[PDB]
Design an enzyme around this catalytic site. Structure first.
Site, PDB file in Angstrom:
ATOM      1  N   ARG A 117       0.755  -1.149   0.111  1.00  0.00           N
ATOM      2  CA  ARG A 117      -0.193   0.067   0.073  1.00  0.00           C
ATOM      3  C   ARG A 117       0.829   1.369   0.112  1.00  0.00           C
ATOM      4  NH1 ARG A 117      -5.881  -1.253   2.596  1.00  0.00           N
ATOM      5  NH2 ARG A 117      -5.919  -2.768   0.620  1.00  0.00           N
ATOM      6  N   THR A 121      -0.639   8.294  -0.489  1.00  0.00           N
ATOM      7  CA  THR A 121      -1.981   7.799  -0.591  1.00  0.00           C
ATOM      8  C   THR A 121      -2.093   6.253   0.215  1.00  0.00           C
ATOM      9  OG1 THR A 121      -1.400   7.106  -2.857  1.00  0.00           O
ATOM     10  CG2 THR A 121      -3.270   8.800  -2.522  1.00  0.00           C
ATOM     11  N   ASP A 215      -3.627  -9.241  13.492  1.00  0.00           N
ATOM     12  CA  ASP A 215      -2.775  -9.106  12.495  1.00  0.00           C
ATOM     13  C   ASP A 215      -2.334 -10.661  12.128  1.00  0.00           C
ATOM     14  OD1 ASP A 215      -0.119  -9.101  10.467  1.00  0.00           O
ATOM     15  OD2 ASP A 215      -0.968  -7.116  10.357  1.00  0.00           O
ATOM     16  N   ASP A 218       1.524 -11.695  11.443  1.00  0.00           N
ATOM     17  CA  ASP A 218       2.438 -11.486  12.376  1.00  0.00           C
ATOM     18  C   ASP A 218       2.099 -12.471  13.671  1.00  0.00           C
ATOM     19  OD1 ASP A 218       3.696  -8.989  11.837  1.00  0.00           O
ATOM     20  OD2 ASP A 218       2.157  -7.841  12.797  1.00  0.00           O
TER      21      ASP A 218
HETATM   22  O1  LIG Z   1      -7.148  -7.449  10.313  1.00  0.00           O
HETATM   23  C1  LIG Z   1      -6.347  -7.634   9.412  1.00  0.00           C
HETATM   24  C2  LIG Z   1      -6.916  -7.224   7.945  1.00  0.00           C
HETATM   25  C3  LIG Z   1      -5.957  -7.856   7.082  1.00  0.00           C
HETATM   26  N1  LIG Z   1      -4.812  -8.190   7.458  1.00  0.00           N
HETATM   27  C4  LIG Z   1      -3.846  -8.602   6.319  1.00  0.00           C
HETATM   28  O2  LIG Z   1      -3.680  -7.488   5.492  1.00  0.00           O
HETATM   29  C5  LIG Z   1      -4.094  -7.378   4.064  1.00  0.00           C
HETATM   30  C6  LIG Z   1      -4.922  -6.237   3.842  1.00  0.00           C
HETATM   31  O3  LIG Z   1      -6.219  -6.483   3.694  1.00  0.00           O
HETATM   32  P1  LIG Z   1      -7.317  -5.561   2.876  1.00  0.00           P
HETATM   33  O4  LIG Z   1      -7.369  -4.397   3.649  1.00  0.00           O
HETATM   34  O5  LIG Z   1      -6.520  -5.570   1.666  1.00  0.00           O
HETATM   35  O6  LIG Z   1      -8.322  -6.280   2.499  1.00  0.00           O
HETATM   36  C7  LIG Z   1      -4.656  -8.637   3.680  1.00  0.00           C
HETATM   37  O7  LIG Z   1      -4.028  -9.380   2.860  1.00  0.00           O
HETATM   38  C8  LIG Z   1      -4.862  -9.335   5.028  1.00  0.00           C
HETATM   39  O8  LIG Z   1      -4.194 -10.911   5.191  1.00  0.00           O
HETATM   40  C9  LIG Z   1      -4.378  -8.709   8.499  1.00  0.00           C
HETATM   41  O9  LIG Z   1      -3.240  -9.261   8.734  1.00  0.00           O
HETATM   42  N2  LIG Z   1      -5.091  -8.169   9.521  1.00  0.00           N
END
Ligand SMILES: O=c1ccn([C@@H]2O[C@H](COP(=O)(O)O)[C@@H](O)[C@H]2O)c(=O)[nH]1
Ligand SMILES: O=c1ccn([C@@H]2O[C@H](COP(=O)(O)O)[C@@H](O)[C@H]2O)c(=O)[nH]1
Ligand SMILES: O=c1ccn([C@@H]2O[C@H](COP(=O)(O)O)[C@@H](O)[C@H]2O)c(=O)[nH]1
Ligand SMILES: O=c1ccn([C@@H]2O[C@H](COP(=O)(O)O)[C@@H](O)[C@H]2O)c(=O)[nH]1
Lengths: 224, 224, 224, 224
Positions: A117, A121, A215, A218
């Site tokens: 990401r 932005t 997470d 993690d």
């Molecule tokens: O509570 C969360 C939400 C998402 N992710 C991870 O971070 C990425 C971002 O999710 P998203 O915002 O694209 O849907 C995903 O691949 C997901 O596996 C986590 O580890 N924890």
């Protein structure tokens, strides 16, 4: 409220398949969700649940009828699966699911996608990827245990499509989703199929699903 | 046809749990029933299917209700399983299932019962048994892939009962069954629970299940 | 000749440990080196060899004498391992060893490092990393199946050192190495320990070890 | 002490193979012998060690030279193991070694033998056996974790011989042994091969190995 949420998802998105909400599945989820859960346990249960998940998704593949003869010289009418497939993991959380897929589909090809990401932005950016060459001709099991904003998965699909993967041949295997992520994937790629174990309530300002699991990556890799 | 049979059994025997007949389940059944299937393949698939059956079976145990607090610091409403259990295999065939149970239940206690039919007399005799000392106080996962006349399983149950196991605490885990075997089990021990993956049409002259699978124990261990 | 190269490596670098050259080990390497071998097989044997390699590496860790009493009530004098450790894989080839480590070290924390040589410059550059927070205090099993020019592993080591990991606490676990790669690692970080299963004769203009095994990463993940 | 012992045995019995006494090996042995270790740990560690043991034993098999061409289009001179084999479990203790064997040798044929000592007489008697039909043509990996007085294994070998297996083709795989045990096996069948992890001091006033591990079968299956 969950039931209602569950049903609405189900009635709204014909392409999502929710795993049967058995007691054991619930047991697993509680262990996994519990903050208090120790790392070895988290891995053990996460692993167990993933296999069931995988088994469920495999039912989304196409099959043909096949008839065989039993050792009692009597015919049995069954089916066989004949498709070219592969799994694609979203690094690194999705990586946690490869072993699962490798356990039931011996030597299945595995592609990996690393998405980031942006800092200014936060538009997701493709950082790295290694995929099977003939991927365009395969059914794709796309692996990502968590779907919150769906930003990552939608990016992954974009690239898959760009490379030639038929949108309707993409199976998104997921453990926990948020209604919002769900809505997004289908508004962008109505033809993909999604298999999940659970649908939570909402996302937080931090974009974590709630009640959620924290997470995943993690927790599963132990890089808290 | 198979549907008719299934319906009857489902209707008359409220204690049997047929597993969801998925295409995947079927494909797996097609490979393991195929007389042409090589032993390595035979083993890989049986194992795969056993894994699913075991998972299905575990849902038969009693569970509480348990609340945990997630990393998001919110609480989640879950469940937990609190019973003392053990698995008991009917040697040899039942043994094939031990790996599956140990896979999902680390260090679960395993009892063994060798029952054999007198070569002239045709009757079941208990030849050897080695069970946990407090088996009387636990839930018993009774393991035997096949159920034809139900002779062996019935005897296994009789011995368990003599040790003080509660009938209502035995969960008979099976892969393939003939209607008659099911009917017999229930005639004698109406309170056990049976989980199975397929129900065949009938036994043949040699009391083999048809269309059947052949001799499970021989195909699985390779003493064909 | 191999013997000569082997011995030379051995007498020159006290810090390397070569797995015992058993016939089985060689049978294994044979399977995986054969360009004719199918993915499922390659995977199979690669995982098998990795298990042994890991077990071998685990002996480089420090241990304490420990005395216990048997169920016969007599003492035995044993020697427990009490250090904190973790695995760090070099994506993506190293990731293949992760499951091996996890098989034997339940829930061991796994860090990941993604490096890539510059097209022009050839300077390996760090692209991504996710490591445990307290890695500075741990012993690290650095995983990379192939060590050719050693550029990547030296970069991986550089960042670990930057992070605060003590050089002498790094254990590089490798399957195949080129004498050249070995010499570089020790010229730069004389205090690390390296465990490999085999030393080949040389490296080619495209930087592949020869006779070598080809690209481990595609071979294993099936992206070739 | 122990060093003397190992030396004597190694010297007097050219057909016994002791595994390398590594610190890790020792560490595993310490956990398994410890009377305070919980059943799950006991199982996890025994499986791990059994895995190393089998890999070691496989080196006792005959092998062919084999040359292959690597992907670099260059030759590599390897070896190939061509013999037909099978594992033979001594029920019930040896059954614990099956999984390990099946882990490295997928779908290998598994024979079983149940030998029991008369409750009064103490004579070991064949109670039950199920072996591959062509066992006489194969190489036998005879499994039994413990070898105290060697009465059991001796009987098992005797029945294998009656079936036609060559004494020279029997590879006895054992975890722990007593000197007496070893001695007898070699007096009676000087031609078998024996692989083991450790040799203890002696037997108990009640025929238990000391310091030992206790009743392995009870500890492993959890019927103690
Ligand atoms: O509570 C969360 C939400 C998402 N992710 C991870 O971070 C990425 C971002 O999710 P998203 O915002 O694209 O849907 C995903 O691949 C997901 O596996 C986590 O580890 N924890
Ligand atoms: O088609 C069949 C029927 C039975 N059996 C085995 O034969 C034994 C006798 O079964 P039953 O007649 O008591 O139910 C059982 O242990 C069962 O696993 C088979 O291998 N194949
Ligand atoms: O014959 C070879 C040599 C290297 N590598 C891979 O190339 C990368 C760079 O190797 P090196 O030149 O830094 O050591 C490593 O990740 C290694 O796994 C191969 O797959 N095959
Ligand atoms: O300390 C010991 C000694 C022997 N045995 C078991 O007792 C049986 C008889 O051993 P032996 O006296 O024939 O060699 C074997 O199956 C062996 O596994 C134990 O469990 N623990």
């Amino acid at each position: 409220q969950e039931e209602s949420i569950l049903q609405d998802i189900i009635t709204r998105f014909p392409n999502v398949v929710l795993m049967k909400q058995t007691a054991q599945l619930r047991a697993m989820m509680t262990i996994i969700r519990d903050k208090e859960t120790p790392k070895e346990e988290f891995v053990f249960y996460a692993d167990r649940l993933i296999r069931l998940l995988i088994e469920e998704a495999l039912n989304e593949l196409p099959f043909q009828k096949k008839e065989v003869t039993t050792p009692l010289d009597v015919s049995y009418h069954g089916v066989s699966f004949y498709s070219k497939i592969c799994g694609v993991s979203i690094v690194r959380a999705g990586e946690s699911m490869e072993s699962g897929l490798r356990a039931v589909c011996r030597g299945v090809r595995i592609g990996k996608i690393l998405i980031q990401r942006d800092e200014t932005t936060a538009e997701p950016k493709l950082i790295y990827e290694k995929l099977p060459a003939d991927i365009r001709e395969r059914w794709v099991m796309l692996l990502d245990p968590m779907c919150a904003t769906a930003g990552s998965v939608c990016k992954a699909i974009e690239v898959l499509l760009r490379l030639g993967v038929k949108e309707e041949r993409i199976i998104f295997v997921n453990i926990l989703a948020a209604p919002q992520g769900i809505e997004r994937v289908f508004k962008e790629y109505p033809k993909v199929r999604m298999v999940t174990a659970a649908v939570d309530i909402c996302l937080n300002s931090r974009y974590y699903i709630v009640p959620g699991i924290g997470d995943f990556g993690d927790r599963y890799f132990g890089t808290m």
